[PDB]
Design a protein around this nucleic acid. Sequence first.
DNA 1: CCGGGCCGAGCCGTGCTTT
DNA 2: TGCACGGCTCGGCCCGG
Lengths: 246, 246, 246, 55, 55
Amino acid sequence: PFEIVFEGAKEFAQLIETASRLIDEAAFKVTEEGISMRAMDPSRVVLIDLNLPASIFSKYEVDGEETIGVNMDHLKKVLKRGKAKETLILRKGEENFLEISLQGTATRTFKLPLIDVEEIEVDLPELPFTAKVVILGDVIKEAVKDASLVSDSMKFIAKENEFTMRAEGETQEVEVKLTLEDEGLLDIEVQEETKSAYGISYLSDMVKGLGKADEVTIKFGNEMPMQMEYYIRDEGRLIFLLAPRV
Amino acid sequence: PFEIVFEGAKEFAQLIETASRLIDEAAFKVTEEGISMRAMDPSRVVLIDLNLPASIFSKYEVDGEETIGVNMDHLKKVLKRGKAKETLILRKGEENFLEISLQGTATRTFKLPLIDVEEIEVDLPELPFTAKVVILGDVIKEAVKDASLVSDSMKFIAKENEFTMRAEGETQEVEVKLTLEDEGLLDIEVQEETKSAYGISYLSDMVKGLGKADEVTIKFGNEMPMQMEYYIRDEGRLIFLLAPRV
Amino acid sequence: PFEIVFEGAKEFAQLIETASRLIDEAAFKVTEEGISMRAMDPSRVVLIDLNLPASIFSKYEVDGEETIGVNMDHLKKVLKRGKAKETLILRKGEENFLEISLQGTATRTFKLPLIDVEEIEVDLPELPFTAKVVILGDVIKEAVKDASLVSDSMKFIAKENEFTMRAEGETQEVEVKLTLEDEGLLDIEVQEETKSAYGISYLSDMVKGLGKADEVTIKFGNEMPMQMEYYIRDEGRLIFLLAPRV
Amino acid sequence: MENVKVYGVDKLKGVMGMTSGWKMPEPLEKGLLRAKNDVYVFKDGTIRFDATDAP
Amino acid sequence: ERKMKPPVQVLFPIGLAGGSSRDIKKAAEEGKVAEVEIAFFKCPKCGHVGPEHLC
DNA sequence: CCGGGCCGAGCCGTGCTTT
DNA sequence: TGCACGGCTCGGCCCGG
Ligand SMILES: [Zn+2]
């Protein structure tokens, strides 16, 4: 029966909300190292991998390894009730329930019965990523919004010390370009010329909820899936794997 | 013919809005001591009591007693137009018309009709309340909003140095516990153990629009209607009587 | 081929959005002095005129004169994509495409195809106006909002050192009165008693978008149209003409 | 839900009342799987697709 | 495709407990009780009774 | 930052020359 | 039997106070 404590319950609520915007069910691994989760959206186009090392937890008491399956909607709604100052506690006794306790001016405890979510193993090997760029969340958020405004798909084109992202509509046109000398980008390293396209629905779903002062690392190449990832408390990490079009 | 003056039009607007969420039409009695109202929910579940001593109002001039019958929706919409710092004046003359003057950067006047409403006198004297507790508004508001998720009935439990609110559903469950060491519970005086249940919709309607930093006194007994009351501007008070369920 | 630079794209977006509420398509006349627009709504009840001399523009560069036409919805959306502190840039080449770019934290450029609209030049000669009243935007906004509560028409009544806007319904009545000594009125110049009425729909549509602290001057006569004025950064101006009622 | 292990279905449409003379109901597992896969049912319990015909 | 006048996904009666759209899941969530004309089956061995074909 | 207002969606309805 | 209007309800956005 493990016990976990996390300061800043609202951060965890936002993280789980972002992770649950694509998958309707999820199985979380509990281990000596930390929490872990992986799944695929029903359409089988985006892969979500989540890692929470034990270091980022105020307390972490685990005496084994197991998996807990919870319905994402119920957990999300329960976690939305935590204020920015609350401390979140997760525990599980020998009984088949999960207890979510929020602490502060008063103690409030919820009980969610575990479900039997089946396990499907999937992992992708390291891919040869010609181009790699790290940017801030706000610029990508606005760019995706504009592309959705005009067109239905986006194109990621990057060259030596230059990153641009276009969205050609039926008649209109959108062009956003940036350079390392600009504040939007932090660095670029392009092995060779690269370009690809991706859907706008999934991009809007995953990029939503990004903070202004957050660094996002994007890796992509020629007509192969793009990988986006950003860190949680300098040790956690959330990764997406968006497939290409055509 | 009377002239009544009041500052902070939004406070009066919130009072009227709370009163008007249960009674479609009500009659206010005006007298030298002040203003009072007493109505009852159409389904015969919730009773509303009002009392506004003449000390609350900045100016209070009236000779004799007259009954005022006004549709609650129109009055609510009219009073909803008052900003926070508006000075609200209620006036009447020989004509059976009620005037509502709002004074600010610009003076604005409204005229409303009067409709006769049958008045029924129903006063409930002191009833045997085994347990009486007084808590902040925020604690009860959050407890109700949390219990709203699992089910539509909330259970109140009172003990020696212990106050508990819990809800149960088909598969989920919530529970909030308070104790004298906590800051939510100011004081508890229970002669013997008691327990009851109440409808969530009524509790939310009664507790909605309640100051976060306030003092609410709750009195209830074994399977008998609860009594909730709080002071307004340090003089006026409200009282609610909610029938138990089952 | 022109290069127009405007600081504070939010104000430009607000101005264009206010202009576009009544009409659908308009042609912008650009010359060596500034930009001017004029149109009439499909119901032939409101005429809107707008001008923007070169003094307000941070940088102006035009050779000759041309009229540029474009759909109001798409332009409104593109402007709404702007921010509070960005600088708007309107530029065009030989190709008949309107290129809009916003240069803030990052540079984004949209393409908006052009459209040709028939031009019906009409000028209504200045009429004998028997009243000129200058009031703040907040007072008129709130007065319209109250008047819309009881009836769908509003009435003006000018008098020597006296202004008052009314509204009457089947039973309820609303009245707002102010004088020179008040802080809501700056100057009043009436030649003779005046009375008129205007629809609340059009007044609400055109008033929405005026700052709380602003200068608005209204010219109206006896059973004749009304004119509303207010300056844009002390150089440009906006003209509204509304036909009377009855 | 426990039987077919399908938990994420948000909506599951039914009928106001059965028009047959037996008023037998259909198993809910089939409805859950249909909702998951985004297909609809017909009066006799089959999924159909309509199109114009050419030779 | 082919859909009923209000789209349906399972041939199960719900009545008005689901709303205008006859959502079975929403009715299930709110712990409602529905009264409708349906056929029940009884297990010969133990005595379970309900709208099912297997005990 | 919490709450109203406004705006699609999605159900139930009607109605489609007549001495 | 396809179209066109008009009463709800009912969530997801937003924006300002
Ligand atoms: Zn059996």
